[PDB]
Amino acid sequence: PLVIDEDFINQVEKHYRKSLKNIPFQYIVGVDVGATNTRIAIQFIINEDQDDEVFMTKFPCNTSTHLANYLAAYGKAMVKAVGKGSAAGSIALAGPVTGDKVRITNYKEHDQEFFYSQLPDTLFPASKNTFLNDLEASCYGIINVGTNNRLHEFFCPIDALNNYATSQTVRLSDTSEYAVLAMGTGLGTGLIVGSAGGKFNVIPLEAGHVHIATPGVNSEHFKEERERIEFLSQKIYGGAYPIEYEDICSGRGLEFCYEFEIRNDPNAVRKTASQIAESYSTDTYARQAMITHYRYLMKAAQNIAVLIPTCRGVFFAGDNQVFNEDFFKEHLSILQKELFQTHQKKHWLTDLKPYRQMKEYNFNVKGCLQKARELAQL
């Protein structure tokens, strides 16, 4: 009763039939589990270690049970299509990885725990798999693009008026550390950490779930900032808890911000995150909600840069960042001031280099496939 993507499976079978019946081959698996959709990538390998074709599909999923069932079904279809299981598999999930489980933060709350044991061995063979956080996987994808000297094709300095970037102005130094943040359904955060010798490690973070502090009592917009922080505590938690960065820096958080802006307008109607991002030019409430949404993204990055004294750069990543580039560039001055000026430790941040993604790319799946490639020991 689980519908396999027919186009995907026919492509895999057609490729097996035309190209793989009489040569040695393997395949590695990369799975990108977001809060509302999961992507599966199959990368074939021939000639011991050469990339062959990659095939991808995606399905709606927001419970752990459904995710386990879909992965089991895709494992059986793959074995049926090409005659054997994968050589290695990597899965990245939108939650904190603690040992042998992940709690997928924005899956339905009654069924968000996914365990290592729910991986099908057909796609994740024993001792040949990794359990990753989604933003952690993006970091490995970013490292890998950096190694291939293409980081400046996907990111530019936030103040690049014409998106100009070079291998000199956008690069990863193996003696530096970088924060990565990506606003989507949730606020993903992580650290890329260099080691002399060109090696990079990734530190997973859950900074999207630390509490937002209120600005100083004599700061310019104190009254409104505090009013919003209290309004949202009431709305999201009944006031039992204060808000996290993700309660503003997310799709649902953008919608909450808009509802705050329109709260005293009896004629205003709430808008979805998409409608807000599309209509900020003609709807001043949407502009203000967008400004708030991205201002607190800057504060989240500022919080990490104060927390991590060796943090030298920050990458604002994700497809949403690319989609909102016009808004971001039009309000650059406001967002730089938020990042660099609104902390008494601003002199610690003077040299922080911020970058924004300027081309769509699935760094998650890229990180997964590279991790699986290493595990496969080709």
Ligand X SMILES: Nc1ncnc2c1ncn2[C@@H]1O[C@H](COP(=O)(O)OP(=O)(O)NP(=O)(O)O)[C@@H](O)[C@H]1O
Q: By CB under 6 A, name the binding residues for ligand BGC.
A: 94-96, 105-106, 133-135, 184, 186-188, 206, 208, 246
The whole-angstrom separation of Cα 264 and Cα 255 is 16
What are the tokens at 61? 């999923």
User: What, of ligand BGC, ligand X, none, does residue 206 touch, CB below 5 to 8 Å by kind?
Assistant: ligand BGC
H-type alpha helices, 16-131: 64-82
209 neighbors 256 (Cβ within 8 angstroms):
no
By a kind-dependent CB cut-off of 5 to 8 A, residue 36 interacts, out of ligand X, ligand BGC, none, with ligand X
Q: Shortest distance, CB of residue 244 to ligand BGC, whole angstroms?
A: 9
Among ligand X, ligand BGC, none, what does residue 302 contact (CB within 5–8 Å per kind)? none
> Does residue 230 touch ligand X according to CB under 6 A?
no
Which of ligand BGC, ligand X, none binds 324 (CB below 5-8 Å, type-dependent)?
Answer: ligand X
Locate 227 and state its tokens. 């009013």
Q: Name the residue nearer to ligand BGC (CB basis): 20 or 91.
A: 91
DSSP code for 197: T
Interface of this chain with ligand X, residues 165 to 184, rule: CB under 6 A: 184
Q: Is 141 in the site for ligand X (CB under 6 A)?
A: no
Among 67, 170, 254, 304, binds ligand X (CB under 6 A): 254
251 makes contact, choosing from ligand BGC, ligand X, none, with CB < 5 to 8 Å by partner type, with ligand X
The C-alpha atoms of residue 73 and residue 290 are separated, in whole angstroms, by 41
Q: Does 105 bind ligand X (CB under 6 A)?
A: no
Alpha-carbon distance values, 137 to 93, 189, 295 (Å): 9, 11, 25
Nearer to ligand X, 130 or 357 (CB): 357
Closest CA to 309 of 355, 351, 249, 246: 351
Count of C-beta atoms within a 10 Å radius of residue 96: 16
Using the structure block, give the residue that is written with the tokens 């807000």: 276
- The interface region with ligand X, picked from 201-209, 233-241, 271-279, 304-312 by CB under 6 A, is 271-279
**Residue 246: contacted member of ligand BGC, ligand X, none (CB under 5 to 8 Å, by partner type):** ligand BGC
The one-letter amino acid at 15: H
DSSP-derived pairing of the beta strands 353-357 and 155-157: antiparallel
| Residues within window 317-376 making contact with ligand X, judged by CB under 6 A | 318-320, 323-324
Distance CA 342, CA 37 (A): 36
β-sheet bridge partners, residue 39: 32, 58
Using CA atoms, how far apart are residues 273 and 250, in angstroms rounded to an integer? 9
Q: Which is nearer to ligand X, 332 or 378 (CB)?
A: 332
In the list 10, 274, 310, 341, the residue contacting ligand X (rule: CB under 6 A) is 274
Q: Minimal distance in Å, beta carbon 279 to ligand BGC?
A: 25
- Site residues (vs ligand X, CB under 6 A): 34-37, 184-186, 251-252, 254, 273-274, 277, 318-320, 323-324
